Amino acid sequence: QSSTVGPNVVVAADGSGDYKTVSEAVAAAPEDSKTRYVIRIKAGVYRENVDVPKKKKNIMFLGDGRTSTIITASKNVQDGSTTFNSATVAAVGAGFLARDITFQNTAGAAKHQAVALRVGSDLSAFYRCDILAYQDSLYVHSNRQFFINCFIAGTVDFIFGNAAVVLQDCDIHARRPGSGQKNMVTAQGRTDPNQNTGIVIQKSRIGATSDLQPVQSSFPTYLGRPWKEYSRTVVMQSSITNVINPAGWFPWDGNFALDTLYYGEYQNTGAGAATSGRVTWKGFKVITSSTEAQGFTPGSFIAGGSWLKATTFPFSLGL
Ligand SMILES: C[As](C)(=O)[O-]
Ligand SMILES: C[As](C)(=O)[O-]
């Protein structure tokens, strides 16, 4: 009954729109378009896997609310799929955008790798979205990405890959895993020192879900572990609860990558932000210089001044 950002088509599970599924709307969009194609998705639950391929550029998902618009599935590695192919939603075509919607994978802790959202789109952004799963929830696979005011939940390596991404003003919570497991917020995979990639968490809130908080002393949680030799992750200007063990970071396999990785922390607050008991690795560092920290902000790390304004979402370029 209204139009904000120009809508090209309407999807509705109750049958009151143009098509009943999200996949139908993506199929209708023309290839190689210079203008944006907007898909409005009405309230409801959509049981389907969705793919946005390389030739479908500048596509936007516009839901009616993060709490009421859900895309769900349950592909996983324990049952036969590969990590890459297990994603409920896969966004590859350049310039993808999404707001007010949920992406989820319901496989569970016992099914191992099971992705909710995989992104390989250059210059893509997400606003007011929820991404929910257990092991490997968010696959930030490749290219430049931006997440603002989003909620992400998971257990083992739930934010992983080799893209250049910044998550600003977000809520990131670890949940209760399976017996004997340990949670890891990130698993960055840079393999060469000349690659311009890494994971940055800025002005956000890191904590625990309601089912984990009471038993944090039975399921340890860390900020991350080095999947590849030149892993690079930064946490700055954020609040951190005591869900994070004092050591801060965890090894991958012995002394692998400890001398070549770059894990840094700048002006964080909260019980979990103390640095006096952190690991002794050569690659770990407490940043005290503002010029060093500024290099990881949107304007300097993902060329934000050239495209964030055109996303129609809110943003901040510096410190
Ligand atoms: C009459 As109608 C397209 O707003 O449901
Ligand atoms: C080995 As992994 C980063 O898929 O958990």
Which CATH number does the domain housing residue 275 bear?
Answer: 2.160.20.10
Q: Is 301 in the pocket of ligand 2 (CB under 6 A)?
A: no
Q: What are phi and psi of 128, to 5 degrees?
A: 55, 50
Q: Which residues contact 125 (CB under 8 A, 6 or more apart)?
A: 97, 98, 145, 146, 147, 148, 308, 311, 313
Residue 291: helix, strand or coil by DSSP?
A: helix
- Tokens standing for 286? 């407490």
157 C-alpha to ligand 2 centroid (Å): 6
- Tokens standing for 123? 């210059």
Cα–Cα separations (whole angstroms), residue 279 to 27, 252, 264, 275, 284? 50, 13, 12, 9, 7
For residue 160, which atom of ligand 2 is closest to its CA?
3
The Cα–Cα gap between 84 and 196 comes to: 22
Residue 256: helix, strand or coil by DSSP?
A: coil
Q: Please list the active-site residues.
A: 136, 157
93-108 burial code (b ≥16 CB/10 A, e <16): bbbbbbbbbbbbbebe
> Given in angstroms, what resolution was this structure solved at?
1.8
Nearest ligand, measured from the Cα of 225: 2
Q: Tell the residue number behind the tokens 């946005």, with chain if given.
A: 52
- Tokens standing for 17? 């729109």
Nearest ligand, measured from the Cα of 140: 2
Other C-beta atoms within 10 Å of 15: how many? 7
Other C-beta atoms within 10 Å of 264: how many? 18
Cα–Cα separations (whole angstroms), residue 85 to 14, 21, 308? 29, 20, 29
40 C-alpha to ligand 1 centroid (Å): 13
Cα–Cα separations (whole angstroms), residue 96 to 121, 123, 154? 6, 7, 23
The Cα–Cα gap between 300 and 292 comes to: 11
Q: Whose CA is nearest to atom 1 of ligand 2?
A: 227
- Tokens standing for 297? 């902000």
Length of the chain in residues, anyone?
319
- The residue type of 40 is R
Question: What is the 3-class SS of 272-289, one letter each residue?
Answer: HHCCCCCCCCCCEEECCC
34-48 burial code (b ≥16 CB/10 A, e <16): eebbbbbbbebebee
The coordinates were experimentally obtained by: X-ray
Residue 32: helix, strand or coil by DSSP?
A: coil
CA-closest candidate to residue 129, choices 165, 163, 153, 160:
153
211-234 burial code (b ≥16 CB/10 A, e <16): ebeeebeebbbbbbbbbbbbbbbb
Ligand 2 pocket mutation, candidates 118, 137, 160, criterion most atoms within 8 A of CB: 160
Q: Please state whether 134 falls in left (phi above 0), alpha (psi between -120 and 50) or beta.
A: alpha
For residue 189, which atom of ligand 2 is closest to its CA?
3
Nearest ligand, measured from the Cα of 183: 2
- Tokens standing for 205? 């809130």
Q: Tell the residue number behind the tokens 């001044």, with chain if given.
A: 305
- Tokens standing for 54? 């390389």
What beta strand segments (E) does 74-220 contain? 89-91, 97-105, 117-119, 124-132, 138-140, 144-148, 151-154, 159-161, 164-168, 171-174, 183-188, 198-202, 205-208
The Cα–Cα gap between 112 and 107 comes to: 8
Domain containing 91 equals 2-319
Number of domain units in the chain? 1
Residue numbers in the known binding site for substrate are 83, 113, 225, 227
The Cα–Cα gap between 133 and 107 comes to: 8
Residue 229: helix, strand or coil by DSSP?
A: coil
Q: Whose CA is nearest to atom 1 of ligand 1?
A: 1
Q: Is 187 in the pocket of ligand 2 (CB under 6 A)?
A: yes
Is 298 in contact with 317 (CB distance < 8 Å)? yes
Q: Which residues contact 280 (CB under 8 A, 6 or more apart)?
A: none
Residue 188: helix, strand or coil by DSSP?
A: strand
Is 150 in contact with 132 (CB distance < 8 Å)? no
Q: Is 1 in the pocket of ligand 1 (CB under 6 A)?
A: yes
2 C-alpha to ligand 1 centroid (Å): 10
Q: What is the DSSP letter of 19?
A: B
Q: In what order do the strands lie in the sheet with 117-119?
A: 50-52, 89-91, 117-119, 138-140, 159-161, 183-188, 221-224
